[PDB]
Amino acid sequence: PVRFQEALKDLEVLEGGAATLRCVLSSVAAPVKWCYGNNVLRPGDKYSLRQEGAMLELVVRNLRPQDSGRYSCSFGDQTTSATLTVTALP
């Protein structure tokens, strides 16, 4: 049964950049679901959902302070979660 072998990590990123949230599955499986709080994310201009084998990646583009908070990744019954902190640009 597929598990998150490597959990999501808490990150701190500057405003305006791109945040890359990464985790790893115990085998190559799909599809995974990404969430911000309890909201399931849709691939679009804001979020890019990427997969490279067992490596999973969420790109949060055009980072604003409102994009900060808890993100999660889920597959079947398994979940992993971390927080994104956004730091204001000088």
Curated annotation (Swiss-Prot):
Lineage: superkingdom: Eukaryota
Ig-like domain span: 1-85
Signal sequence residues: none
Cysteines paired by S-S bonds: 23-73
Assembly: Interacts (via protein kinase domain 2) with CDH2 and (via protein kinase domain 1) with ATP1B1. Isoform 3 interacts with TTN/titin and calmodulin. Isoform 3 interacts with ANK1 isoform Mu17/ank1.5.
Annotated disease: Rhabdomyolysis 1: An autosomal recessive disorder characterized by severe and recurrent rhabdomyolysis, usually with onset in the teenage years. Some of the episodes may be triggered by exercise or heat; others occur spontaneously. Rhabdomyolysis is the rapid breakdown of damaged or injured skeletal myofibres and may require intensive care management. Muscle breakdown results in release of myofibrillar content into the extracellular space and circulation, resulting in hyperCKemia (hyperCK) and myoglobinuria. A chromosomal aberration involving OBSCN has been found in Wilms tumor. Translocation t(1;7)(q42;p15) with PTHB1.
Name of the protein: Obscurin
Source organism phylogeny: Eukaryota, Metazoa, Chordata, Craniata, Vertebrata
